């Protein structure tokens, strides 16, 4: 698209709608754009001496992008609590995007005094890596995503990114992208950029909460058919002698009961408690943790695979870093204390995946015999076993939404850990920069490489719309389900509002399995 | 419809369905029906002695009825839920009803030993009053509708009715109906009746709450420009001297603001507290409860005209008579104490209507001048006033559903004051009688009533399906709604469950407003 | 109850806000809420136009009815005018009636 300087290149879609089926949440903010790196690539790396579990090598670029992997970016509380309450499913469908309204500023220091103002003819190109050929940066958690809240104007992100390294140097395979070596499609005022994305057959989040439970699944009325081993040894007057007896499994019997699929897999958590008291008083948050490690830099176990956060009675632990966990609107970077963040809580899968902090089962060790004592041991780590079923990390509205699969020859069961849609293409990379603006050059010829331009930097609105397609629910549940709801009783502030200085905030994380099929 | 003896005369349907628009709860029961009156038409009147207030003229009829007209007859628990949480509104459009299955026994006594079998032959009439030539008893909460509960038998309820009296005795103008007068269909096994209904142009029941009230509804920011009288006297050195000044309402101002409508009407009502305490002792049951009265009798006044039950922080108050109380599964029938019932709560409305135990305002008294004071006196009683809005009982999964609008030269604004939806024409009364069978009759002629007949009962399924409309939800609200949930808790029981024992019961009244509209 | 028409479905809200302008910011990133705009404000022109019906009056009623004058001596100020420093004034509030109709 095109057109003339007084002349919105785009309107402002905010909406939301739901088509019983579908559901489409458009949404527009506004944005601000700096010139990085005063214009140029630049190399780095970790910090020479930093741990070896830490270094790196990468550039960091002139180039900023844009970002809405996070839920909210596209629905409103209220909205999200629809969906939440009455779809056993959902996944993404489509997208559309689109820039526009864009405006390059420049602003002027003269002395004690900045003076901002228009350069109308100046230029920010924009460009969709849409082949995939950068370091997919997106889905790594990082912050700098849409607002939440509409009314809130951001900044854009800037693009870096990480190759090979042997410590704080680099090693040859690593490679060096150059953002311009692409074609970057150029905006003046009175240019939008549009694009449309379609997604690719995922599986519907999960957004249920199961009724029944692997080992409590068969009927209590009826006993099986099947023998089970009842006792070994037997009364001998005085003395036992062994002699195995089978018995029939039936409810009084049950833990016995014989089955016919197993727990999901599991990785083995410390155990933290939301009470100071209980936890022991020393470092281990890095010691303790369970962590895995490649070319020999240990690295930590975030988002470990999903399982369960705490046994019946315990909403008071957690795992070490078994679960995601969000800041307090305002909660400043670095070892804040527990209240000022939110921990999110995995119960609802208990009922399949094993519980983070507890081990799997426990097989046999030794074979006995009458001068042998049978063994056994407790099992920490249990790897995908044929017979497994499991559930997924839940996705939380300010949650990740989806993730690149990394192209490897191999991957097994690709939900993205940290949670949310696993892609094979996800939506590709939106760049932005601010085509340079040399100021004044001099009169007589040189060849070095231009280093004085006006200082500027560029604003304008964005917005994107998605379709998202539903399951609906269908349970003959006769009593009611669980519903998420907002508290009845006077408060202060109402959640998910602007206080008294108008800063929106978040007070809870959302989950998504409110709502209850069976097993 | 009509076939043989062995053969299904219908099929078991009860299931609901929901179509984004409609939704289709159908639903099926199984009943008895035993002879009444021994057969005959009983002419029945109050005790001779007992209270004018208590007087009364009527029949018990042979005859018995069907009634389906609580809510609960149709969803179901979870269904309601769904209804309830996303529905600006809904009303019931059609119907379809079908008895069928029916089946004749005849117990026999012989000395001590009672032996039921099959009278195949003999039937069961019914019939359908669709000319609504009988006085309407449905509507009267009275109770022997259907089960809540699906898998529940039930007994079907016995006609009769009442007419004019002049204390316990008739007065001529009083009409006395007889059922045979009708052409009641006859059915024998194999035979089933259906019939369908269709209901009139009726308003959505307002199943949400309002976040605006009448007096706070204008914008804060702005100072209207109508003027109002702010102070009367002035200081005069020492003393005041009157003289009238006027201010322009603003938002500190606010109860002296400008408006433009008024709240609905009121009657006040005794406030008593759940607690025990605070409540005076004594008898003001009837004594000080209030009420209106026809022909010298005083008749109480329930389910008051639909006015809020409390103030803000004083849910432990309700009016004497201006609350729907429901009793918990069990509860006796006569002065059980309040933890055997469950009071339903119309906070909802303040909003809107006047608080039932507080008096509507305050009008002047007298004319002031310098010689005397300005008066001024309360409302306890305010009639229908141009302006007034107001909202209507909410509804109560276990409450009424609606009521036959009485045949008179006037009405006025009919939501049944019970709650409900107000009918011209409801769905007509459905009667079912055993036509008699005369037990062996005596060789030797007589003209005299027959008065041995054969012992017997009947019983087999009915059926009831019926479709709803609805209204959707649809507000910019961002914040969440508060929707109705269960509570997440262990539990000895589930609410809306059986017990040990196998006895469905309903734990709590659920109402209908939890989705927020402005006002 | 103030007077007027009472509308189920009244004019529509209309709404206008400035989209704002981020003034200058930092060249390093921040993820806070942007706080510095350029200060800046809007105008320019409205029109509102209605089309109202009327009831044309029929009465037989032969002496004259009122009407609403305004005041033939002379004063300082015409009403509904601008004084000497130019300020637009309503004098009296007007009513609407002033026609006689019988009940």
């Not at 019983?20 to 005063?38: E, F, H, K, M, Q």
């Not at 809130?152 to 953002?179: E, H, I, K, W």
């Not at 209980?278 to 470092?283: F, G, I, L, M, T």
């Not at 010829?445 to 719309?465: D, P, R, W």
């Amino acid at each position: 698209g095109a057109d003339g300087v007084g002349n919105s290149s785009g309107n402002w879609h905010c909406d939301s709608t739901w088509m019983g089926d579908r559901v489409i949440t458009t949404s527009t903010r506004t944005w601000a754009l700096p010139t990085y790196n005063n214009h140029l690539y630049k190399q780095i790396s970790s910090q020479s001496g930093a741990s070896n579990d830490n270094h790196y090598f990468g550039y960091s670029t002139p180039w900023g992008y844009f970002d809405f992997n996070r839920f909210h970016c596209h629905f409103s509380p209220r909205d999200w609590q629809r969906l939440i309450n009455n779809n056993w499913g959902f996944r993404p469908k489509r997208l559309n995007f689109k820039l526009f309204n864009i405006q390059v500023k420049e602003v002027t220091q003269n002395d004690g005094t900045t003076t901002i103002a228009n350069n109308l003819t100046s230029t920010v190109q924009v460009f969709t890596d849409s082949e995939y050929q950068l370091p997919y940066v997106l889905g790594s958690a990082h912050q700098g995503c849409l607002p939440p809240f509409p009314a809130d104007v951001f900044m854009v992100p800037q693009y870096g990114y990480l190759t090979l390294n042997n410590g704080s140097q680099a090693v040859g395979r690593s490679s060096f992208y150059c953002l311009e070596y692409f074609p970057s499609q150029m905006l003046r005022t009175g240019n939008n950029f549009t694009f449309s994305y379609t997604f690719e057959d995922v599986p519907f989040h999960s957004s249920y909460a199961h009724s029944q439970s692997l080992d409590r699944l068969m009927n209590p009325l009826i006993d099986q058919y099947l023998y089970y081993l009842s006792r070994t040894n037997t009364p001998s007057g005085t003395t036992t002698q062994s002699r195995l007896q089978f018995s029939q499994a039936g409810a009084s019997d049950i833990r016995d009961q014989s089955r016919n699929w197993l727990p999901g897999p599991c990785y083995r958590q410390q155990r933290v408690s939301k009470t100071s008291a209980d936890n022991n008083n020393s470092e281990y948050s890095w010691t303790g943790a369970t962590k895995y490690h490649l070319n020999g830099r240990d690295s930590l176990v975030n988002p470990g695979p999903a399982m369960a956060s705490h046994k019946d009675d315990e909403e008071k632990f957690f795992p070490q870093s078994g679960v995601l966990i969000f800041g307090k609107q305002g909660s400043e970077k670095t070892n804040v204390d527990i209240e000022k963040v939110m921990i999110t809580d995995e119960e609802e899968i208990r009922t399949t995946n094993p519980v983070a902090t507890e081990q799997y089962g426990s097989v046999s060790t030794n074979l006995q015999r009458g001068n042998r004592q049978a063994a056994t041991a407790d099992v920490n780590t249990q790897g995908v076993l044929p017979g497994m079923v499991w559930q997924d990390r839940d996705v939380y509205l300010q949650g990740p939404i989806w993730a690149k699969i990394p192209h490897t020859d191999g991957h097994f069961h690709p939900s993205p850990l940290m949670g949310g849609f696993g892609l094979k293409h996800p939506p590709p990379q939106i760049l932005i920069k601010n085509t340079p603006v040399p100021a004044n050059p001099s009169t007589t010829f040189s060849a070095a490489k231009f280093a004085s331009f006006i200082t500027q930097y560029s604003t304008g609105q964005v917005s994107v719309e998605i379709e998202w397609e539903l399951q609906k629910e269908n349970s003959k549940r006769w009593n009611p389900e669980i519903q998420y709801t907002s508290n009845y009783n006077k408060s202060v502030n109402v959640d998910f509002t602007v206080d008294t200085n108008g800063v929106y905030s978040e007070p809870r994380p959302i989950g998504t399995r409110y709502l209850t099929r069976n097993l």
